[PDB]
Design a protein around this ligand. Structure first.
Ligand SMILES: CCCCCCCC/C=C/CCCCCCCC(=O)OC[C@@H](O)CO
Ligand SMILES: CCCCCCCC/C=C/CCCCCCCC(=O)OC[C@@H](O)CO
Ligand SMILES: CCCCCCCC/C=C/CCCCCCCC(=O)OC[C@@H](O)CO
Ligand SMILES: CCCCCCCC/C=C\CCCCCCCC(=O)OC[C@@H](O)CO
Ligand SMILES: CCCCCCCC/C=C\CCCCCCCC(=O)OC[C@@H](O)CO
Ligand SMILES: CCCCCCCC/C=C\CCCCCCCC(=O)OC[C@@H](O)CO
Ligand SMILES: CCCCCCCC/C=C\CCCCCCCC(=O)OC[C@@H](O)CO
Ligand SMILES: CCCCCCCC/C=C\CCCCCCCC(=O)OC[C@@H](O)CO
Ligand SMILES: CCCCCCCC/C=C\CCCCCCCC(=O)OC[C@@H](O)CO
Ligand SMILES: CCCCCCCC/C=C\CCCCCCCC(=O)OC[C@@H](O)CO
Ligand SMILES: CCCCCCCC/C=C\CCCCCCCC(=O)O
Ligand SMILES: [Zn+2]
Length: 283
C-alpha cells in the first residue's frame, strides 16, 4: 500500500501525550490522525501490537463463550433466567472491558483528544469487569442469605462507580499516577475480602474450603496482586530497557493476566453453578 505509510519511532520523539512508558525505547507508532491507518496498524509490528491482539482475541473468545452460555439447556440450571442474567452481567462486563481495551490500544496514537476519550473507556472497562465478576459470585455465595447479597452488590456498585468517576480525572491517566491506578483497581478487586470474611464467618472453615472457593479465591487474589505489581513496577522492561519493546513487556503481560483472570473467575463461578444444580435451590 502507498496510503497512510508510517515508520516506528524511538521514545524521545513522541509527543507528551503518547510518551507513556520510558522503558519501551523504540517501535512506537507515530501520531497518525487517521482511524484508517490506526486500524490498519493492527497488522503491524510495534509496541502496542501484543496489547491489541491479546485483548482483541480475548474479546472474540468471551463473546463466543458468552453466546454459548445463553443457549445452554434450561435443564442445566436451577432458575435458568435469573442464573443467566447473573452470568450475562459477568460476560457483558468481560466483553466491554476487552472491547474498550483493544479499541483504545488500536486508536491510541490517533490524536490527544482520541487518546483521552478512549483511555477513559479503557480504565472504566476494568471497573466493569470487576463489578460484573462479583454479580454471579455473590449470587451463589449468598444463595440462601439475601440481605448480605443485596448489600454487597450495592457496595461493589458504589466502589465501582467511584472508580469509574476517578478514571475520568485527567491527572489519573498520567505516568506519575500509574501506581494510584494499580491501587484503585487492586482495592476494587481485593474488596471481595469483605464478603469473603462474612461468608467464612457464617458457613465455616470446613464448608468454605471443601466447596473449593478458598483455593480458587486465593489463586484469584494472587493473579490480582501479582498482576498489579507487574503493571506498576514496569517489569520486565525496567530491567531490560530496549529489549522488551515489542514482546512480553508489563502491559502485554498484564493483558494476559486479565484474560487468564477472567477465565479462572468464570471457571470458579461456573463450578458454583454446577454444584448449586446438584444440591437444588432449597435451604
Ligand atoms: C466493537 C467492534 C468495533 C469495530 C470497529 C470497526 C473495526 C474495523 C475497522 C475500521 C476502520 C475503518 C476506517 C475509518 C476511517 C475514518 C477516519 C478517517 O480517516 O476519515 C477520513 C475523513 O473523514 C476525515 O479526514
Ligand atoms: C452459537 C450456537 C450455540 C450452540 C451450542 C449451545 C449448547 C450449549 C453450549 C455449551 C457450551 C459449549 C462449548 C462452548 C465453548 C466456548 C468457547 C468458544 O466458543 O470459543 C470460540 C473460540 O474458539 C474463538 O476464539
Ligand atoms: C497488597 C494490598 C494492595 C493495596 C490495596 C488497597 C489500595 C487502595 C488504594 C487507593 C488509592 C491510593 C492513593 C495513594 C496516592 C498517594 C501517591 C500520590 O499522591 O502520588 C501522586 C504523585 O505520584 C503525582 O506526581
Ligand atoms: C451473550 C452474552 C451477554 C450479552 C448480552 C446479550 C443479551 C441477550 C439478547 C438477546 C437474546 C435473546 C434470546 C436468547 C435465548 C436464550 C434461551 C435459549 O435459547 O435457551 C436454550 C434453550 O432453548 C435450551 O433449553
Ligand atoms: C445482560 C444479558 C442478560 C441475559 C440475557 C439472556 C437471558 C436468557 C435468555 C432467555 C431466557 C431463557 C430461560 C427461559 C426458560 C423458560 C421455560 C422453558 O422451558 O422455555 C423454553 C425455552 O426454550 C425458552 O428459552
Ligand atoms: C456485547 C457488545 C459489545 C460492544 C462493544 C463496544 C465497543 C465500542 C465502544 C465505544 C465507541 C465510542 C466512540 C465515540 C466517538 C464519537 C466522537 C465524538 O464526537 O465523541 C463525543 C462523545 O462520544 C464523547 O462521549
Ligand atoms: C468520554 C469520557 C467519559 C467516558 C465514557 C463514560 C463512562 C463509560 C461507562 C460505562 C460504559 C458501559 C456501561 C454499561 C452498563 C451496563 C448496564 C447496567 O449496568 O445495567 C444495570 C441493570 O442490569 C440492573 O440495574
Ligand atoms: C457491566 C456489568 C456491571 C455489573 C452490574 C451489577 C448490577 C446488577 C443488578 C442486579 C442483579 C441482577 C441479578 C439478580 C439476581 C438475584 C435475584 C434473586 O431473586 O436472587 C435470589 C437468589 O439470591 C437466590 O435464589
Ligand atoms: C477500595 C478501592 C476502590 C476504589 C474507589 C476509590 C477511588 C478513589 C481513591 C483515590 C484516588 C485519589 C488519590 C490521588 C492522590 C493525590 C491527591 C491530591 O491531593 O493531589 C494533589 C497533590 O498532588 C498536590 O496538592
Ligand atoms: C474477580 C472476583 C473474584 C472473587 C472475589 C475476590 C476478591 C479478593 C478477596 C479475597 C480472595 C482471597 C481469599 C483467601 C482466603 C480467605 C478466607 C480464609 O481466611 O480462609 C482460611 C482458609 O484458607 C483455611 O483453610
Ligand atoms: C478477574 C480479573 C483479574 C485479573 C488481574 C487483574 C489485575 C489487578 C487489577 C488492576 C491493577 C492494574 C490496572 C491498571 C490501570 C490501567 C490498565 C490498562 O490500561 O491496561
Ligand atoms: Zn491495556
Amino acid at each position: 500500500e502507498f496510503e497512510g505509510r508510517w515508520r516506528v519511532i524511538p521514545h524521545d520523539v513522541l509527543p507528551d501525550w503518547l510518551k507513556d512508558n520510558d522503558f519501551l525505547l523504540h517501535g512506537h507508532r507515530p501520531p497518525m490522525p487517521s482511524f484508517r491507518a490506526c486500524f490498519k496498524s493492527i497488522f503491524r509490528i510495534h509496541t502496542e501490537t501484543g496489547n491489541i491482539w491479546t485483548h482483541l482475541l480475548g474479546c472474540v473468545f468471551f463473546l463466543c463463550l458468552g453466546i454459548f452460555y445463553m443457549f445452554r439447556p434450561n435443564i442445566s440450571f436451577v432458575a435458568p433466567l435469573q442464573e443467566k442474567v447473573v452470568f450475562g452481567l459477568f460476560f457483558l462486563g468481560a466483553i466491554l472491558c476487552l472491547s474498550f481495551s483493544w479499541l483504545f490500544h488500536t486508536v491510541y496514537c490517533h490524536s490527544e483528544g482520541v487518546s483521552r476519550l478512549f483511555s477513559k473507556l479503557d480504565y472504566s472497562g476494568i471497573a466493569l469487569l470487576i463489578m460484573g465478576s462479583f454479580v454471579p459470585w455473590l449470587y451463589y455465595s449468598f444463595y440462601c442469605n439475601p440481605q448480605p447479597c443485596f448489600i454487597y452488590l450495592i457496595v461493589i456498585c458504589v466502589l465501582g462507580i467511584a472508580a469509574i468517576i476517578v478514571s475520568q480525572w485527567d491527572m489519573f491517566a498520567t505516568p506519575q499516577y500509574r501506581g494510584v491506578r494499580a491501587g484503585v483497581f487492586l482495592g476494587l478487586g481485593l474488596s471481595g475480602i469483605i464478603p469473603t470474611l462474612h461468608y467464612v464467618i457464617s458457613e465455616g472453615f470446613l464448608k468454605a474450603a471443601t466447596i473449593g472457593q478458598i483455593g480458587w479465591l486465593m489463586l484469584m487474589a494472587s493473579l490480582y496482586i501479582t498482576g498489579a505489581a507487574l503493571y506498576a513496577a514496569r517489569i520486565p522492561e525496567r530491567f531490560f530497557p530496549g529489549k522488551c519493546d515489542i514482546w512480553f513487556h508489563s502491559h502485554q503481560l498484564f493483558h494476559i493476566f486479565v484474560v487468564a483472570g477472567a477465565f479462572v473467575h468464570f471457571h470458579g463461578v461456573s463450578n458454583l453453578q454446577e454444584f448449586r444444580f446438584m444440591i437444588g435451590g432449597g435451604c
